[PDB]
Amino acid sequence: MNRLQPVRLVSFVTTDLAGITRGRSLPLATLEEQLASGCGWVPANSSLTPQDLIDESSPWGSHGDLRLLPDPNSRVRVEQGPDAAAPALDYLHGNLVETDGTPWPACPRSLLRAEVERYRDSGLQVIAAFEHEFSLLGLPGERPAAAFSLQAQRAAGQFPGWLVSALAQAGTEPEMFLPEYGQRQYEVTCRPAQGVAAADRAVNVREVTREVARQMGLRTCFAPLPAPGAVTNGVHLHLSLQHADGSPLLYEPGRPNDLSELGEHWAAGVLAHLPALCALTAPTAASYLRLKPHHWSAAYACLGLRNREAALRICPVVSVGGKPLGKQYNLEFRPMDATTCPHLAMAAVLIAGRLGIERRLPLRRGIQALPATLGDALDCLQRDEALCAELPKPLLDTYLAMKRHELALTAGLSDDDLCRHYAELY
Amino acid sequence: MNRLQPVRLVSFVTTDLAGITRGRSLPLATLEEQLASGCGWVPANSSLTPQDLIDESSPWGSHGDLRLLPDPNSRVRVEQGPDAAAPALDYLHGNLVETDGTPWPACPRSLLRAEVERYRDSGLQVIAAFEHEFSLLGLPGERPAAAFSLQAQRAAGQFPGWLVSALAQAGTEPEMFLPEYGQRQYEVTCRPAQGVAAADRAVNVREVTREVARQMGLRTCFAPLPAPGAVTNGVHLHLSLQHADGSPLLYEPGRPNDLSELGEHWAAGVLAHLPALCALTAPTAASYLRLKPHHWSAAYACLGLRNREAALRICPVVSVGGKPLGKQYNLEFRPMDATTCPHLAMAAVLIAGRLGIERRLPLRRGIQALPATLGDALDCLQRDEALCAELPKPLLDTYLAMKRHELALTAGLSDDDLCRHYAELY
Amino acid sequence: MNRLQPVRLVSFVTTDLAGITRGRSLPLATLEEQLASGCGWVPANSSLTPQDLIDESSPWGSHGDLRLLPDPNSRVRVEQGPDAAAPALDYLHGNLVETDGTPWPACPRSLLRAEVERYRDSGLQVIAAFEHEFSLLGLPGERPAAAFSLQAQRAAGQFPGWLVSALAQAGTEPEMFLPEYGQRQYEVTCRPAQGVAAADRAVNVREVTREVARQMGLRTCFAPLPAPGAVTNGVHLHLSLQHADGSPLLYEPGRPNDLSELGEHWAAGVLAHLPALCALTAPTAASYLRLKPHHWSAAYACLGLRNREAALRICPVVSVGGKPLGKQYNLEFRPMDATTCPHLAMAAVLIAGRLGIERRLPLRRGIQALPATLGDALDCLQRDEALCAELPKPLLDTYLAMKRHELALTAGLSDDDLCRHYAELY
Amino acid sequence: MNRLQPVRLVSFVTTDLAGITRGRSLPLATLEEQLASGCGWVPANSSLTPQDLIDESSPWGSHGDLRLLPDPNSRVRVEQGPDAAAPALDYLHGNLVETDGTPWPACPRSLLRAEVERYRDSGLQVIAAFEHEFSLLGLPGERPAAAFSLQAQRAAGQFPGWLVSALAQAGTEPEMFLPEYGQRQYEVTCRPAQGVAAADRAVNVREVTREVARQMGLRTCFAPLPAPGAVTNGVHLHLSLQHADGSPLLYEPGRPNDLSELGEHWAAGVLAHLPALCALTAPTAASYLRLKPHHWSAAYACLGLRNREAALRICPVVSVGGKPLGKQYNLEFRPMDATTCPHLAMAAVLIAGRLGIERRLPLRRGIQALPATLGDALDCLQRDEALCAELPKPLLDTYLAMKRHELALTAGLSDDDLCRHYAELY
Ligand SMILES: N[C@@H](CCC(=O)O)C(=O)O
Ligand SMILES: N[C@@H](CCC(=O)O)C(=O)O
Ligand SMILES: N[C@@H](CCC(=O)O)C(=O)O
Ligand SMILES: N[C@@H](CCC(=O)O)C(=O)O
Ligand SMILES: [Ca+2]
Ligand SMILES: [Ca+2]
Ligand SMILES: [Ca+2]
Ligand SMILES: [Ca+2]
């Protein structure tokens, strides 16, 4: 009489400290009833390593279970993708809380929201955009064409058109799609967002790219190193800081670089803490094949107007034809990859920046090397009590333990095996 | 309710010194906002060799990044090709400029536009057409049929019909399609265009042929030598010179050949500089398997009414039935292949011609051999200070360095490997 | 909005001395403009051997290039074939001329048209039909069925129905289709045509049979010997001669055979020159596996009412039921195959016939063996100054050189290899 | 605008002495013009053996060629078969004649028509039906099911339904379809026909069964022995003889068997000549694997009311429920297979019967063994001057020579090879 429909499922998700987005789903009809209670969640999930193992070193064994509470404003709805028979993608980001309503200290979305608050309190809005690079696997046709080339964009067939449309439907404001330097490498960028929404966007961009690829029988890889001796997949975070008003507070013509005193304090905090921030913005064992790629590199916490050997780069304005200038002025953090948790990573950066501003840190030998393995990066984080102290203590323990465990699971493992290993997790 | 559409992406492209067309794309809805700023671009991309490597010998490391500024008049729109599910091909050629509006010296489109200007200033319009030969791979059916044969055109199935239509839609004015001498070789020719548009056409003809082949599951090859011991793929440039008026200034009946004094000066400049022009019109290592094909050849800078052993050939008029005569009179430069950058190549030729005219060079032993390897061809370019001096100096450095590097990357490599190597890049 | 169409291409063709039809194509919209100028063509193409090689022994290197001038009356239009997605077949036969309008002496269509003229001048119309045999490869189903059998016609599926229809659309007047003696052998015959149109038909019948087979994923072979120890593929030319009026001038009841005095002169010229005509009507190296098939054969220039061991056969009238008689009276030349150029072959025959009539040659030991290899056949042609003299001298040189070269390319080569070799060219 | 149609071809056929049906076809539009002249045919085709070879022992080399003159009353039209895309089957049986109208003595249809005449002259109509058995190869599904079984009829899928319909459309009057004793064996029977039409039916039944199988991707085999150690494929001819009126003249109740004096004379002639008739009703080398199947058999010319070890069997009437009786009374000849020429075979039988009647031969040791090889069967035919004398002499020579030649081609060849050999020809 009528050909029946599959039920539309809605997911509640969280993106854990392992940079994985996880959740549970319910029939659409139930969404309203479900919104206030969210869905159950188990605290020990926050001790899962990329390899899906929990240690006994977790603080969370036994301990009473949590609620994953969807925030109604973060809803993503992609009604149609490449495959006309495929279910909508429908889900909401949530915060983790104890059963009474009590904000759970090891929740990475919550931490970022508290830090944005601390930002608001002293009059700063946070405006950010994550740029994402990935490998597109499975495409038909010839060997990959030249880097950056029209042919490489063409080889992708209907994928870029469907990707941008899926990201538009998902409310990401897609804006640029391009083939990048490596073989099968592409990049999609979106319009900036304020606060938490900016990290939600980073998650949405990843989860939707994955879903479009799935719908076409393709695969993506966001691992920092897609395969041995490949061009690496970065994530770059552009941050501007604005008076509760739209007035750009990072930027001041005629002061050199066009950087504010405020600006310089902010950048200085990020710089002084970078070797720690690496544990949180290049947080996996595979991250260090990207950060220290060739024999000795070392890689430093310095600044650039000029070059992209700099960990933090000033993105100067474009005058050219109309504009306007300064709204587009921002600072780009570069030692970041997609194995991160967008919320934890952005939170970590805005923190050290805050600490820069709070102690009116001056902008400078006054320059550290970034660590060279995850181990070294966790050493650094442990040594930076100023930064650690801004992190809710249970997060730090569960993070610090979970990562030791991640590196336990990976040790002895060749550089190559490790890269192949992670190219299967991101 | 409605089956959604993939977003239409518009690309901004540049064709680099490596003869590769590269760019970035945006959603159609944004095109208007995007036109004034263009899109970002990195100067160091102009040091990429055909093998996609940059040396430390580049002038562009560190240095501040550029804008790729689409010229609205060069837009290509192919709405439909062989595959009804395929995205339109939509893109615009752009010039590279520094962030304030400042014409970037290493931009090959810009250089050609400045040279056309220098042409206009002294009263000459430049009218040109590039003829393109290519291999069509993947066709079903028997062994390839006879050279030039109806059967060989038929074997191509729906490809020639879809090719001409795609080129028509792209505003190239396709005019001739034919099977050529080698197995799977075809040639498409188009109507001449004035100035920059003539080089844009050369790029458009290549990029669209590639896209039609892609849409049918076929492949093209434009490399100078498609495979070992194959008939070679040439590019021939027909140039006529006209008073700002349509009055042909190359041609004068009864003066022998029907060549003008002007004409002879022009041809003489091209001839005297040919061994240098080779570095810019046969600019890849694989180019010399085509220019000096058999054991000793050597190949010379001479002229022909008569034969195609001549590097520069007068294409006499066709009277026959109606006509008219002289508008169709032109000169064809022959040591050119598709590994070039249409704009750089045409610019280089019109330059030496200009120098011919400026020094009223007479038309003649007064005859040089064309070089025999890329190395020799770059030696020659370095030795021809008259020509070098017309090139913006940063272009020359970045070109000269990038090509050494290209030949570094290829050395020791057998003639055959080199040909197979390049048959994968063009 | 509208699903676009592939452009319809029109070809201009010539059938060269190698019996290959070659040309170039243009968009339909341009046909009118293009008709007066035709398209470019290179004289040296007339020195290509079946194996697609030109020697230095060609008269045409250097020499200025030609026009291929479509004759509007020879247009072939097949709008639809077996594959509904396939392009029309659209092309016109052309004559080759120098750039001013000047009939090029090495053009085989032109030579035949001049000979028909010489025929008209003395009051004779030439009426001819070529019968064609070929192999049809790729058919599904069992081993081939019995020679001449209903099952063999049935095995061909939709091919004969589509073949006749394609030939009807092409204006060939198809009339008979039949399975022949060899495995996968078929024959199609058409209604006779006058003069040049008769040779155009021979070309059209070949090119369309090929196109129908292509459209069905089948292949044809017209080589004199399709594969080792196979039944051979002949071409038979039926010629009648008529007063500028329809009055048959070959035929006279009661004179024996019903042959005219005129008739006997004509046949006598053909007979006296046959060993030369073989170089032009069995003109390839593979032709002699057909003409002298078994150990000693030798094969002679004699006549038959009676049998098909005769090189020239009188095809007597059919009374039976109605008729009428004499209009259908003709003479069939038999040592002919599809590796010929229909125009060159028919021209050559009508010539020797003319010479028969001009010298009132009587009809007779007065009997020669036909040569046994191409070499011997070219010896014979060189020795027959009477015939050579009617050929435009440049044709003869370019032909005579091109064929030496063909036999150079083939020598040492086994009988079998040679047959397999040619089964790939026709 | 309109999707064009393939041309409908009409064939003119003859069934040669080798039991193969051969012909040539023309476009439907031409059928009317073509009917009076028929189509050309070559006398030497009547010397082709089953293996498609002609000897020098043929009487027909040189000799002037013939007309195949379609008899308009024998037309077969099957407009639709299993494959909706397949051409109609359209053809007419013809008689062979010399070019003036003169009945050709070696034509098997003509001979049978002359014998039916000789029958009419003395007041007898000839009423006959051929029963045909065949193998159906290629069927999907399990091993073949039990002999005679519903499952075996079912395994044939849509074939029996399409076979009967095709035979109905062809005007054969199909009446029975059944699985038979051997694996993949089927039998179709039709209503009797008078005279020549009865043999045309036998040909039509074979050619259409073949065409239906072709349309479904199946194959048939009618060879006397389909494969080594298989149940054999017979052909049985039922003959009744009637006053020019419908009055059955074979049958007389109360005279024993219900056989007429006339009847007994007729049967007696068939019996006395059977060892010769075998050369014409079991006429191939493979026929003797069927006639003498096991070690010694020998097989005799005797009669049966009773059993099917008899070469000639009385088919008694069925009373049962209504009837009527005697119209259905007939005699069945059994040593016959599908390698015959229906017309030659039926002609041969009616002859010896005639000779029985003419010499009022009595019905009886008075009993011969049937030969055991083709050789012996041809010996017998040569020895029976009474029978030979009724055959047009040129038929006999061409037959007798063609078959020696057939057995030359097959000698040394194992029983099995021979069976496999012929299973490919019928
Ligand atoms: N793929 C580089 C970024 C290159 C670029 O986009 O400039 C990275 O790992 O960060
Ligand atoms: N394929 C030749 C051109 C031959 C021609 O079109 O005349 C080349 O490399 O330039
Ligand atoms: N296939 C034969 C012709 C046979 C025929 O049609 O009589 C030949 O080479 O000419
Ligand atoms: N297949 C048997 C006939 C069996 C029957 O139908 O009785 C034959 O060769 O005649
Ligand atoms: Ca490539
Ligand atoms: Ca995975
Ligand atoms: Ca071929
Ligand atoms: Ca067969």
Ligand SMILES: [Mg+2]
């Ligand atoms: Mg990037």
Ligand SMILES: [Mg+2]
């Ligand atoms: Mg060319």
Ligand SMILES: [Mg+2]
């Ligand atoms: Mg024939």
Ligand SMILES: [Mg+2]
């Ligand atoms: Mg039976």
